[PDB]
């Protein structure tokens, strides 16, 4: 299995190429997709973009399970509208917002280990693309799944969350629960 | 007991530090805080520190770049960075202003953000007014790397870390430090001067 690439490797900071839709069902593409799923599950995390395994192509994978969700208190889960959703694989995804509604919550990236910051994201998204077998799909999501989708689509444009985080909120994981500083906007919606 | 360095997320690092009363500077209380800063800076080792970094909400900075630290970096980088040695310096209530429009872009790390670096745009030439550790009124004119350290430390005093003013797409792990800058990132270096 490929290792998860860390901030600084130019593949993370460069625009990824679209995959020919007619090649999505090939061996090479199908292995990359399978690798992504194994790596996401081994971390574990709720999403992965192909550049994070060294692949300059427009492919994301993502899932959130009852198990992952059981690590967080019910209060957090509620505020975050965080809900289980099946393994999704999107090739050449194009995200657009469904409205102008945003929420502000703490995010971490497997390519930036030991840190988090508060990031503003649209609550409601639609993402068009192809699935794992090359079939055109449209995905509408709200809450936490929406957030994950923007996180992962970001990676495909060479964008990490550190370059769009709320100022003064960046922090170690051990400092996650400390208050927000004077002037930071409150968390939530 | 020596203070530990405070890490990103602790509010003292993200909020504006208060002035030292100039009449208080020569007191044992403030002198101990200064001595603690110098010792924490040296232990690290690093080239500067701000009081919020040892959990003290005061406008105090220390800095030091010795011939021995400098002796480790490549000769080429020292030239480009205009990185010159300078004796230990303490400033209480520092007030920083640029002396021109000339800037430079190089990599920085912060003791408060362990394990990462990023490209940060700084002024080449600055003047800093304040008080020395005896509470005497001073002015320091700095350029090059020393001007850079002064800017990073003064920023800490207003609740500002480099991560919130870094060139997009350059944040990296220390281990990935020397990997190529991505397409569209400005090159490292400075304005002619
Ligand atoms: C919300 C935005 C989605 C971020 C997705 C990231 C993974 C990533 O870097 N994707 O590109 C993640 O899983 N981060 C982790 C995460 O969110 N996890 C780990 C497993 C379950 C879930 C919540 O704890 C850690 C680093 C916090
Ligand atoms: C360049 C702008 C000023 C840097 C000041 C920082 C320390 C800090 O966070 N001060 O508030 C530092 O010393 N950082 C270290 C540093 O610059 N060092 C450590 C020892 C010598 C010198 C060059 O390697 C590391 C993180 C690189
Ligand atoms: Zn990520
Ligand atoms: Zn610092």
């Amino acid at each position: 299995l490929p290792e998860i690439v860390a901030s600084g490797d130019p593949v993370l900071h460069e625009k990824a190429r679209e995959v020919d839709p007619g090649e999505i069902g090939s061996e090479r593409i199908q292995k990359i997709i399978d690798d992504m799923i194994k790596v996401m599950r081994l971390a574990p995390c709720v999403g992965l973009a192909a550049p994070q395994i060294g692949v300059p192509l427009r492919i994301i994978v993502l899932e959130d399970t009852k198990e992952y969700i059981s690590y967080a208190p019910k209060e957090e889960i509620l505020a975050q509208e965080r809900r289980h959703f099946d393994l999704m694989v999107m090739v050449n995804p194009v995200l657009k917002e469904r409205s102008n509604k945003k929420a502000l919550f703490f995010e971490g990236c497997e390519s930036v280990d030991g840190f988090r910051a508060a990031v503003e994201r649209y609550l409601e998204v639609v993402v068009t693309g192809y699935d794992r077998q090359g079939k055109r799909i449209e995905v509408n999501a709200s809450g936490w799944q929406a957030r994950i989708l923007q996180h992962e689509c970001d990676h495909l444009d060479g964008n990490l969350y550190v370059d769009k985080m709320v100022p003064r909120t960046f922090r170690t994981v051990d400092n996650l629960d400390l208050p927000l500083a004077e002037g930071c906007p409150k968390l939530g919606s």
Side-chain angles (χ1 to χ4, degrees), chain A residues 1-27 29-65 67-73 75-95 97-132 134-135 137-181 183-185 187-189:
Chain A
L1 291 175
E3 287 202 339
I4 286 174
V5 172
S7 207
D9 193 315
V11 67
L12 286 174
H13 306 292
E14 283 178 336
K15 201 193 185 167
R17 325 181 283 261
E18 304 186 317
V19 168
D20 179 14
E23 288 301 312
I24 287 167
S26 69
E27 301 173 83
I29 292 299
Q30 289 297 311
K31 191 185 149 215
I32 279 164
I33 293 180
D34 280 11
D35 283 352
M36 287 176 72
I37 302 164
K38 284 175 221 195
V39 179
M40 170 183 66
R41 283 167 171 169
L42 197 73
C45 51
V46 293
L48 200 81
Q52 282 176 285
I53 52 145
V55 172
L57 302 172
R58 302 187 86 82
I59 305 169
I60 65 183
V61 302
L62 59 153
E63 68 180 341
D64 208 358
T65 60
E67 181 173 274
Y68 293 170
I69 284 161
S70 72
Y71 307 147
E75 293 78 8
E76 175 172 318
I77 287 313
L78 188 47
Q80 289 175 352
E81 311 176 333
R82 170 172 186 204
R83 294 178 300 272
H84 74 88
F85 65 87
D86 297 356
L87 184 51
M88 197 170 343
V89 171
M90 303 201 79
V91 176
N92 313 329
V94 174
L95 189 152
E97 75 280 14
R98 275 162 70 69
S99 68
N100 60 43
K101 295 184 184 179
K102 326 202 209 191
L104 183 56
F105 283 110
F106 282 94
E107 273 179 40
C109 180
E110 301 281 328
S111 310
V112 186
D113 183 62
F115 287 88
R116 308 276 190 270
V119 182
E120 204 175 31
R121 304 276 198 193
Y122 295 107
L123 288 155
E124 308 187 87
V125 308
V126 57
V127 190
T128 52
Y130 301 87
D131 71 29
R132 202 219 227 280
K135 186 161 162 146
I137 58 176
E138 174 187 309
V139 176
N140 295 272
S142 56
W144 200 247
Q145 167 177 16
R147 172 169 300 259
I148 303 186
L149 283 165
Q150 307 164 66
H151 188 97
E152 306 300 349
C153 288
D154 281 4
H155 273 287
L156 301 184
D157 277 336
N159 300 321
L160 312 195
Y161 72 92
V162 294
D163 286 319
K164 58 157 71 180
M165 54 188 185
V166 172
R168 298 189 210 185
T169 70
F170 186 70
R171 59 185 63 189
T172 64
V173 300
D174 277 2
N175 288 346
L176 189 40
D177 294 328
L178 295 183
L180 297 167
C184 311
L187 296 180
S189 332

